[PDB]
Design a binder for this molecule. Structure first.
Ligand code: FAD
Ligand code: TPP
Ligand code: MG
Lengths: 155, 169, 582, 169, 155
């Protein structure tokens, strides 16, 4: 139930897009978008049935600036979702986040004496692990990008 | 016209870490402000924050901090915004994944994964038609790979936009 | 306290350990075709007099006698075969007792354990042959754990869906001398995880909360009430549900009370099919819901809400989807049904006279009639003749086929296990050896028997076992010179031809073939030969006072066919109304 | 005819984690049920469980869960089965090693190990006649390598079949 | 005393195979098989003498569907056996399974607060290490595939 949108030359491209999930009342599970001077590739997962997914893949094409909408859900995708978790870096409990960032195989970008910041990347199954497994240590502030998908293309 | 373009930054390029409720339309109330304040949104990446029930939007706005002070308090005029943080005048992590499908042959795939080994890009999916990298890090490493993969048969660069937290260090 | 035949610390032949472990379960009759490879167990039998060898004339006759002693007692019957080819002939009866859910134990010898499966002599790797058709197999490799698995076998014989356990012993195992370590526990760890607990009344609440919701109930009972002597009769004494008894359940409800629906399904009584295909709650006590009773999977009482009580967890939902389902030993859970519902005896429904009025107008409108074309005895009459003469209760064996259901639809059964069948396997040749084991389960009691013209012949060897064992079998032969089941399956399936149905000799088709008088006179047994109804009550009069066994030979008319018969995947809309062989 | 075929899954493809005794014939009593229930066994991998004395069979059956409910309790009708677990309607790890000998030359061996470096395939044995990878992970990464090593001189793909445990996460 | 079997077009290929160790009474030490639409490569180790191994490499060819049986024991093999051990992930004792999965060099696929799942792969000498060395931590449920072998081929 996830959608990739490619859009064209306008400003506030998201406002056309994030409108027509709200004004259509069909909730987005997550969203992220690599905007540029004229191009942007949205990746929107919408927690709805495949019937209402069939609407919003075409109702988003009722917008004008959308160059392409492809429901990427049926494909074998690569759902990769970054999550820059800032964790309380207390060395009584930092000492196991060491491997518990090595397991998820993520860099640790900035460390303080009470705040380290990791860069967990990939499958949302692995992301909801970290959102639960590293929740057992006191989390300062999770920020996460949206799930991004692509075609595992073969012919 | 296949690939997403190069980079998502200019000179001004302020970053605002929003912190909003998990309302179903809460993105459109927030970028509704960036539109209604006449701001282009250069990059944006939403997601669920540490307290499950609220969200967190990390934006990129090309506006100088005088105009951003006309936005950070203006985004406070929204109801769902708990806080905004002008991270741009602070040191801050700037990590952004970037899923780059590249159509390659067999021998050129050798001469791509090595570049992906330079950037510590986990080549998440490969075929014979193509290979899809997945690198992560600052936007300079993002634009360096896309400046270096333009020689190769690039495909849909499904980026994700600058995600930020101000480091304490 | 077990009467030990020998010392408890005597290192001896494992067959002594084996044959004591049989009597340590408390069994008394084996069926032991003698051993060129199971040799010691017959030898260890001969040093015992608590156990009895009824040595059969054929091992398939032996295991059907081990069937016939099992499902005319309830005590888990024991066959013994010789290894290899003797054990291949059990594979008939082991496939009976799995499908018919009969507690059987098959002891068998094997070869020396240094020779097992080596394409050896006298060998059939029957522990691996009968893997698919028994409840469990065994290939014990030591003397000290022979009664480990034996008590585990009689565990597995009694527990769950009561299946056959082929229990094999290698020839050099009993030829290995060791001491019997008797009381070791059931090495049976997975089976205790589904050793079926008593389902309490909270689980039976959504039965009895739907009994009052049930306006049209039917009591689809079968081989799970094989232990329910009066508990089903107590259940219908509590709430009054019109029964639907299947073949292993024929007897369970004594089929002469007010709700006398004998047999249901594709070959049953058509007014019990009316009782089952018109219900709004299909209540089931121990049935396996097979194809030749359900017809269609989804249309067999499609307007009903299935409840289904079984000791077997796997059976629940196997053939038929149940609406709400509860597992558990039925006769135990019926004692936890009738002896707990007396608090609701002024609360429950009992409003089934408007449902008892449906069967009453369709009892006679859907009758059990026949065609006396001249005087060629209707066998469906001849079993109504039987209970007119057999003084009520009679332990009855049957072969299978058209003559099988003629005992089903037309005898008034009075007790479960005073009736034998192969409905699951449908084994021809099961009948007369089932009369052998029934005549040691209930020896002095009336073991009457009926067999078809081929199924009598198909195990006619065990006639010789009778005179050796003085058994008072009372075998009827429903002869029609014909494969009596499938000749109707010529007509109602595709074509009224006679394609290989004729069992008899075409040079003497009007004459008897074979001469069953000179069968019983060959083994010295007295016999008869009946074709007329005047001698019919005369012959059974000569039968039930005959010292020792008796045979007779009715002549079924070779072109007489039974209602109903639907192709597989059918409903009562697709009933046949009057199908004959003419 | 050298290589084992591509993948061991269809649409239905239920997985049953058996838990049986260590009887010498205990596989044949278990797949004896899959045969006698008319089920093709799409993949199977047996092994010794955590209590040394019992086994653990992880199967792949193309059957819908109505028919699997006619099997999980039907496999309980076996004596040695302690438990069956229908893992397919749960999240579950699905790791399967796959030893892929590939005949390669010298220069093509470079253009194979890099692909093996993508999948984190430890190239367990190499010669000049060939190289034998050993990758492990989900069956999609299994079929992706075999779809990508069909361009190369593959040899006996000695797989091992889907092995599973339902994750608690 | 290990055997690789390649079999052809039938269903229940294993039932022919796992029968003719049981009905021949010659115990399998382990087994695993990559079945497909028509092909499957068994890898069976049978704890018996080389005399009885010589029987069952040919008695398995008394079966019809077997395309090839090769006793792989004499060759220099690559015996690689996967073992998805689910270990109790208590962080008082998780803290050393970290390196004690790094030593055996295995991924950890799914982690909970009391259950992590590792992916130990390779030599059965290294596998019986984990079955003993990580037995000193309380093991939830070992599942393991069978030992798989191949020719270390040279000419
Ligand atoms: C040619 C032919 C035609 C037939 N036509 C019909 C027909 O038209 N209609 C009809 O009804 N029968 C017919 N039968 C007979 C039918 O095949 C069997 O009688 C039936 O399938 C098995 O009997 P059952 O299911 O009632 O009980 P069984 O299967 O013998 O055992 C009872 C079932 O419930 C459970 N159970 C077993 N033991 C216990 C226990 N101790 N306590 C509780 N539950 C237990 C078991 O799971 C078992 O499956 C026919 C047979 C043949 C050969
Ligand atoms: C060995 C065997 N063959 C065939 C069948 C199927 N079958 C059962 S009864 C029957 C014909 C009935 O003949 P018989 O059993 O002698 O009794 P009849 O109805 O003729 O009086 C057939 C073909 C069977 N159960 N067993
Ligand atoms: Mg007959």
């Amino acid at each position: 139930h996830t959608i990739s949108v490619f859009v064209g030359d306008e400003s506030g491209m998201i406002n056309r897009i994030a409108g027509v999930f709200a004004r259509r009342g069909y909730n987005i599970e997550s969203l992220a978008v690599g905007l540029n001077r004229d191009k942007a590739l949205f990746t929107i997962v919408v927690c709805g049935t495949e019937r209402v997914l069939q609407q919003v893949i075409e109702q988003l094409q009722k917008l004008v600036n959308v160059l392409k909408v492809e429901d990427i859900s049926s494909e074998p995708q690569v759902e990769r979702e970054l999550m820059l978790v800032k964790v309380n870096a207390h060395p009584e409990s930092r000492a196991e986040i060491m491997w518990l960032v090595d397991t998820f195989r993520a860099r640790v970008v900035d460390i303080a004496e009470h705040a380290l910041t990791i860069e967990v990347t990939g499958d949302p199954g692995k992301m909801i692990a970290v959102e639960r497994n590293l929740k057992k240590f006191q989390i300062r502030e999770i920020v996460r990008t949206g799930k991004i998908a692509l075609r595992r293309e073969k012919m | 016209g296949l690939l997403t373009d190069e980079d998502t930054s200019g000179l001004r390029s302020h970053t605002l870490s929003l912190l909003v409720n998990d309302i179903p339309g809460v993105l459109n109330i927030v970028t509704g402000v960036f539109a209604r304040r006449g701001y282009n949104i250069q990059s944006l990446a939403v997601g669920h924050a540490e307290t499950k029930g609220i969200s967190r939007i990390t934006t990129v706005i090309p506006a100088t901090d005088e105009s951003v002070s006309k936005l950070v308090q203006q985004l406070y005029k929204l109801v769902d915004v708990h806080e905004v943080h002008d991270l741009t005048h602070l040191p801050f992590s700037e990590r952004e994944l970037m899923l780059i499908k590249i159509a390659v042959n067999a021998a050129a795939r050798r001469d791509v994964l090595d570049i992906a080994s330079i950037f510590r890009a986990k080549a998440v999916d490969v075929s014979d038609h193509t290979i899809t990298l997945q690198l992560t890090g600052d936007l300079d490493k993002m634009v360096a790979l896309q400046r270096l993969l333009e020689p190769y048969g690039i495909c849909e660069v499904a980026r994700t936009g600058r995600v930020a937290l101000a480091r304490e260090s | 306290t077990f009467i030990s035949r020998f010392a408890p610390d005597q290192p001896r032949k494992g067959a002594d350990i084996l044959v004591e472990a049989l009597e340590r379960q408390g069994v008394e009759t084996v069926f032991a075709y003698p051993g060129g490879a199971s040799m010691e167990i017959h030898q260890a039998l001969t040093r015992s007099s608590s156990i009895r060898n009824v040595l059969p004339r054929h091992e398939q006759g032996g295991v059907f006698a081990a069937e016939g002693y099992a499902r005319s007692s309830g005590k888990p019957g024991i066959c013994i075969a010789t290894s290899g080819p003797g054990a291949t002939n059990l594979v008939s009866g082991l496939a009976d007792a799995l499908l018919d859910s009969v507690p059987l134990v098959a002891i068998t010898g094997q070869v020396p354990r240094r020779m097992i499966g080596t394409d050896a002599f006298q060998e059939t790797p029957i522990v691996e042959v009968t893997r698919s058709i028994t409840k469990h197999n065994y290939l014990v490799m030591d003397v000290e754990d022979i009664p480990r698995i034996i008590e585990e076998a009689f565990f597995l014989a009694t527990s769950g869906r009561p299946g056959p356990v082929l229990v094999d012993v290698p020839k050099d195992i009993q030829q290995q001398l060791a001491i019997p370590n008797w009381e070791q526990a059931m090495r049976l760890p997975g089976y205790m995880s589904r050793m079926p607990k008593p389902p309490e009344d909270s689980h039976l609440e959504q039965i009895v909360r739907l009994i009052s919701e049930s306006k049209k109930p039917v009591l689809y009972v079968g081989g799970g009430c094989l232990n329910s002597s009066d508990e089903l009769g107590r259940f219908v004494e509590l709430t009054g549900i019109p029964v639907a008894s299947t073949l292993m359940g024929l007897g369970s409800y004594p089929c002469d009370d007010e709700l006398s629906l004998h047999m249901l399904g594709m070959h049953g009584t058509v007014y019990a099919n009316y009782a089952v295909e018109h219900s709004d709650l299909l209540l089931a006590f121990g049935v396996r819901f097979d194809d030749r009773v359900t017809g269609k999977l989804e249309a067999f009482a499609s307007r009903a809400k299935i409840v289904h009580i079984d000791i077997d967890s796997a059976e629940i939902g196997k053939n038929k989807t149940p609406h709400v389902s509860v597992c558990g030993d039925v006769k135990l859970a019926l004692q936890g049904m009738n002896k707990v519902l007396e608090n609701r005896a002024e609360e429950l429904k009992l409003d089934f006279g408007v449902w008892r009025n449906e069967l009453n107008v369709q009892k006679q409108k859907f009758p059990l009639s026949f065609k006396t074309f001249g005087e060629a005895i209707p066998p469906q009459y001849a079993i109504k003749v039987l209970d007119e003469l057999t003084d009520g209760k009679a332990i009855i064996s049957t072969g299978v086929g058209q003559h099988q259901m003629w005992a089903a639809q037309f005898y008034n059964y009075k007790k479960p296990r005073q009736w034998l069948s192969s409905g699951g396997l449908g084994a021809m040749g099961f009948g007369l050896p089932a009369a052998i084991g029934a005549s040691v389960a209930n020896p002095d009691a009336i073991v009457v028997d009926i067999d078809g013209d081929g199924s009598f012949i198909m195990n006619v060897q065990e006639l010789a076992t009778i005179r050796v064992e003085n058994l008072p079998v009372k075998v009827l032969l429903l002869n029609n010179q014909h494969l009596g089941m499938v000749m109707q399956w010529e007509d109602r399936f595709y074509k009224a031809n006679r394609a290989h149905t004729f069992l008899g000799d075409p040079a003497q088709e009007d004459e008897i073939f074979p001469n069953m008088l000179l069968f019983a006179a060959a083994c010295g047994i007295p016999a008869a030969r009946v074709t007329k109804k005047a001698d019919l009550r005369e012959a059974i009069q000569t039968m039930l006072d005959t010292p020792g066994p008796y045979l007779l030979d009715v002549i079924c008319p070779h072109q007489e066919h039974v209602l109903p018969m639907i192709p597989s995947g059918g409903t009562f809309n697709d009933v046949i109304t009057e199908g004959d062989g003419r």
